[PDB]
């Protein structure tokens, strides 16, 4: 039931899962335009631009092939990506939902059987950090919006290591469980102008404050057959989530085409817990560079329906921020998507395919090639309509 299979999820708080809704994830996270039917969870100011109530749900089916200097393996994971609700309230906008901050998952087996007296290990990990958010956006101007949100982080990360010698039948199983909880605040703004005829200049700025995460660790060692487990004293460690600054800018004509770029930078953080402390692994600042956009042939078309589908594409280069064996781990990928609008309604079905490469095989590291297929549902309906003619 894990969300990831990458061994790199062991370090830090796990692999960053949420990267935007399918409508924006298919554009490499570029959300410069102030949409009226889609939710831009990463920027609270977008909540004010909503025109109708929006209900979003998304899921993905990931396929990855882990490669190392020894061999290669294939892994597949299926998960639920998000659940968000947007409600337009006059000039204000309110949004609340649940998104996965990070995920921990890996199933490594070191088979040393067939040789008496050889220890076999079965490393496994599960859990992650989830986020609950509540944001409010306000339209300071018809095309200028500002907003803020509060996010509560909560989750449990459990790491289990079972070792069994070839001869004996009773092995040991050490398990580490950490419960994390904390809150953070985000601020954002979006400004849209008109540079040329029918061409607009979209700008968006978002800032996330640093947050403190409280982790309650519990480490216990169990041996097969023995009914009394050996438990270590409980410990409490403090983690610091780094601050994020997302800058976006793009040019394009609304409902016709859009081209934009986004730059995301993270500050200093402390994601090293008691169980993931290593000497060959360090940390650096996260930095993401992405270019994406969309193209709609003819939104108001009555002859062909394929012209009304929003075609999205994007490129992305991310510096995860961890240096393993003196090698910076970076992720490079391309994304493609399409938004099919249900006839007669603003609701649409989003489909996207993302493929890329994370890590490298050099310095005895692991390289991951992934091809993820995602589906998203965006439902829109107009509420709060008063009925006259008393």
């Amino acid at each position: 039931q894990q969300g990831t299979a990458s061994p790199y999820s062991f370090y830090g708080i796990g692999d960053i899962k949420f990267k935007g809704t399918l409508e924006y994830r298919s554009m490499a996270g570029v959300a410069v335009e102030q949409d009226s039917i889609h939710l831009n969870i990463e920027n609270p100011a977008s909540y004010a631009s909503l025109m109708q109530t929006t209900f979003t749900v998304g899921g993905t089916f990931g396929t990855s092939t882990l490669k190392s200097n020894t061999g290669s393996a294939k892994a597949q994971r299926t998960t639920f990506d998000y659940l968000a609700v947007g409600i337009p309230v006059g000039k204000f906008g309110v949004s609340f939902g649940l998104i996965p901050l990070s995920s921990v998952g890996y199933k490594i087996l070191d088979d040393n059987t067939a040789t008496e007296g050889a220890v076999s290990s079965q490393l496994s990990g599960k859990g992650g950090i989830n986020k609950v958010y509540f944001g409010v956006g306000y339209k300071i101007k018809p095309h200028w919006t500002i907003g803020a949100d509060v996010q509560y982080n909560f989750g449990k990360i459990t790491t289990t290591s079972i070792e069994q010698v070839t001869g004996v039948q009773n092995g040991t199983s050490e398990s580490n469980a950490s419960t994390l909880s904390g809150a953070n605040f985000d601020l954002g703004t979006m400004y849209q102008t008109k540079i040329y005829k029918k061409v607009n200049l979209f700008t968006s700025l978002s800032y996330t404050f640093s947050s403190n995460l409280n982790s309650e660790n519990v480490r216990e060692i169990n041996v097969s057959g023995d009914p009394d487990p050996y438990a270590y004293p409980a410990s409490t460690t403090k983690l610091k989530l780094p601050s994020r600054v997302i800058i976006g800018a793009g040019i394009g004509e609304s409902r016709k085409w859009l081209v934009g770029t986004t730059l995301a930078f993270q500050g200093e953080g402390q994601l090293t817990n008691y169980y993931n402390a290593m000497d060959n692994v360090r940390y650096e600042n996260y930095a993401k560079y992405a270019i994406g956009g969309y193209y709609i042939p003819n939104y108001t078309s009555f002859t062909s329906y394929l012209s009304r589908i929003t075609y999205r594409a994007g490129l992305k280069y991310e510096k995860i921020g961890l240096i393993v064996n003196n090698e910076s781990i970076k992720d490079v990928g391309m994304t493609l998507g399409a938004g099919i609008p249900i006839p007669g309604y603003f609701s649409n079905v989003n489909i996207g395919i993302e493929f890329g490469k994370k890590g490298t095989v050099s310095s005895n590291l692991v390289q991951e090639n992934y091809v993820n297929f995602s589906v998203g549902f965006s439902f829109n309906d107009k509420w709060f309509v008063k009925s006259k003619f008393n």
């Binding site: 609700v85 989830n130 309906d381």
Partner: protein, 618 residues
């Protein structure tokens, strides 16, 4: 053989030829089918058919008549000239009912959808008949609306509702199958009670009649529970708006039931006495699709040898006083069995008074007090398992000498005695203190043709104001299986997660050596996400059958510290649902579990599963 060709419409001033052609949906070159043509023009089999006639009659054209005429027939190709007689628009002028000998007019006139001064509509007449039949005081086969004083020139029509009274009293004999077990209810109901004339003994024929108030004395039972209740409901509280006021007094005896093995131990049971009052009214703001529900209830639980799971005070009693408020918005339509559009959002919150704040009692130090330590209440000196004297009034402790185990006197050193868990739990749960929040979101949309997509997301949270007191052992969530409605009065909720057995995903006791390992204690948190694709094969009033495909994922958690909303048990499958008015809702589903059941040694998929239910087991 004959082929259709050159279909034209005459006399269609309101609707253009292009709009009608789409409604008819007959193209040139198709085989000549007389039945198909008449069905598309005027579907007499059903009153809600999508025909051209219904298009005109539903918009005030009472005198509309559509008749097809074959113009030419050459080269095996037949040509039709659909003739439409629109006629003048008509409005409702006088609406009166006749035949009500025992029912007041205000009760019937308030349920008529054909308001005077509105354009004639066949849907309103059909809806009015349905609403009049829902009352139950009249004959379902004699609700005949008769048109009177029809004035085509003036464009006004008068409707007279001829009703046949058949007695307000009714007998209820219903049955259903949910949660893997049959459930039946039997009761007598008086749907035309009048509380105004309660003290008036002059009019007491089979209870005072008049207002549309309803009083019912029903009995519901299953394998593990039996409940007797008396309920009073006021459909229109205040007389101005359809505000529902309901009260109920019930007594239930719930036995200990193991949903896994479907076995009931009749020796362990508890009795619940509940009194509830509720007020529900449709809100006008923010919109007319919002409904506010409020309720106040008082319950008294009487445990009788109920020593199971987290219930250590098997011979005590608990009292629950809670207030529940719920906001719901529903705009679904049009058929409740097979919705094609709309959504339903519901948020509820049940809260109890915060007794822990005002009463100065330390629930954490209860186990370290003399009053909560095991003691010998006898008055005769006895001998413990250790072979030593146990004088009356001395504290005791449990010691295992050789194979057998027993109590051993500790003297007056209460600090070394065993804490009485039964007394501590009783003090902690003497007055239930908790808060329950439930969130549900259901959305319906048409993808292509008759196929509709349904998205369902449910959340449930149970907690306590003081962590030292602990979460109450009642009002818990059980996930997995076919699911069952909230028939029990203890707050237990059974959630359906196809592809897995009943209550198979509920957290279990993992203490191993607690003497109760493997027992299902209940979950405090639960979240289910489901997606379905349904296709209707028949949507008639006699029988509504539709097929469905689903993709579900859900999980239950014991505490908030273990809440992982994205660690779910996934499943997939297909099912068939049939609804008949006499036989109720029947459903058969086949789901495949992609995950292993909790507590399983091997991480292997659960596999295929079969679920059968009767009724709305939500």
């Amino acid at each position: 053989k004959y082929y259709f060709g050159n279909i034209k419409f005459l006399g269609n001033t309101v609707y253009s030829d292009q709009q009608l052609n789409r409604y008819l949906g007959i193209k040139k070159g198709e085989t000549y089918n007389g039945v198909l043509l008449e069905k598309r023009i005027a579907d007499n089999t059903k009153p809600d058919g999508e025909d051209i006639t219904n298009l005109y009659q539903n918009n005030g054209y009472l005198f509309s008549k559509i008749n097809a005429v074959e113009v030419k027939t050459v080269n095996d190709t037949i040509d039709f000239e659909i003739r439409i007689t629109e006629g003048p628009i008509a409005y409702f002028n006088k609406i009166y009912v006749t035949g009500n000998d025992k029912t007041n007019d205000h009760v019937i006139y308030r349920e008529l959808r054909t308001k005077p001064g509105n354009k004639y509509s066949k849907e309103e007449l059909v809806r009015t008949i349905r609403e009049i039949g829902q009352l139950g005081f009249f004959d379902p086969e004699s609700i005949k609306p008769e048109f009177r004083n029809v004035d085509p020139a003036a464009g006004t029509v008068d409707i007279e509702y001829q009703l046949v009274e058949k007695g307000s009293s009714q007998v209820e004999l219903q049955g259903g199958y949910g949660g893997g077990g049959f459930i039946g209810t039997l009761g007598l109901s008086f749907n035309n009670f009048s509380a105004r004339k309660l003290f008036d003994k002059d009019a007491y024929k089979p209870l005072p009649m008049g207002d549309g108030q309803k009083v019912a004395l029903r009995l519901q039972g299953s394998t593990y529970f039996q409940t007797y209740s008396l309920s009073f409901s006021e459909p229109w509280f205040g007389g101005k708006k359809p505000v529902q006021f309901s009260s109920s007094i019930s007594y239930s005896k719930q036995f200990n039931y193991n949903y896994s093995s479907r076995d009931v131990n009749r020796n362990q049971s508890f009795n619940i006495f509940t009194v509830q009052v509720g007020l529900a009214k449709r809100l006008t703001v923010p919109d007319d699709y919002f409904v506010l529900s409020q309720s106040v209830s008082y319950q008294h639980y009487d445990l009788n040898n109920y020593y199971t799971g987290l219930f250590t005070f098997g011979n005590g009693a608990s009292r629950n006083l809670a207030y529940t408020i719920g906001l719901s918005r529903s705009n679904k339509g049009v058929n409740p069995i097979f919705p094609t559009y709309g959504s339903e959002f519901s948020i509820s919150a049940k809260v109890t008074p915060p007794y822990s704040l005002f009463n100065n009692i330390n629930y954490g130090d209860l186990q370290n007090q003399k009053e909560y330590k095991t003691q010998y209440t006898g008055t005769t000196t006895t001998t413990g398992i250790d072979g030593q004297a146990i004088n009356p009034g001395d504290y005791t402790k449990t010691e295992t000498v050789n194979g057998q185990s027993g109590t051993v006197s500790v003297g007056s050193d209460y600090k070394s005695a065993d804490t009485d868990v039964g007394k501590v739990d009783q003090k902690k749960y003497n007055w239930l203190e908790y808060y329950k929040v439930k969130f549900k979101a259901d959305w319906y949309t048409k993808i292509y043709g008759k196929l509709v997509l349904r998205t369902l997301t449910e959340f449930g949270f149970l907690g306590a104001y003081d962590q030292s007191r602990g979460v109450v052992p009642f009002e818990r969530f059980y996930l997995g299986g076919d699911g069952m409605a909230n028939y029990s009065m203890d707050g237990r909720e059974t959630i359906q997660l196809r592809g897995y057995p009943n209550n198979s995903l509920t957290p279990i006791i993992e203490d191993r050596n607690s003497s109760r390992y493997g027992q299902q204690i209940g979950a405090t948190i639960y979240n289910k996400f489901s997606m379905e694709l349904r296709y209707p094969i028949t949507l008639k009033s006699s029988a509504s059958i539709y097929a469905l495909t689903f993709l579900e994922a859900g999980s239950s958690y014991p505490t908030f510290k273990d809440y992982n909303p994205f660690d779910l048990n996934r499943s997939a499958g297909a099912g068939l649902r049939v609804f008949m008015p006499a036989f109720g809702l029947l459903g058969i589903d086949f789901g495949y579990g992609f995950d292993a059941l909790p507590g399983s040694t091997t991480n292997k998929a659960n596999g295929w599963e079969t679920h059968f239910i009767i009724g709305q087991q939500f």
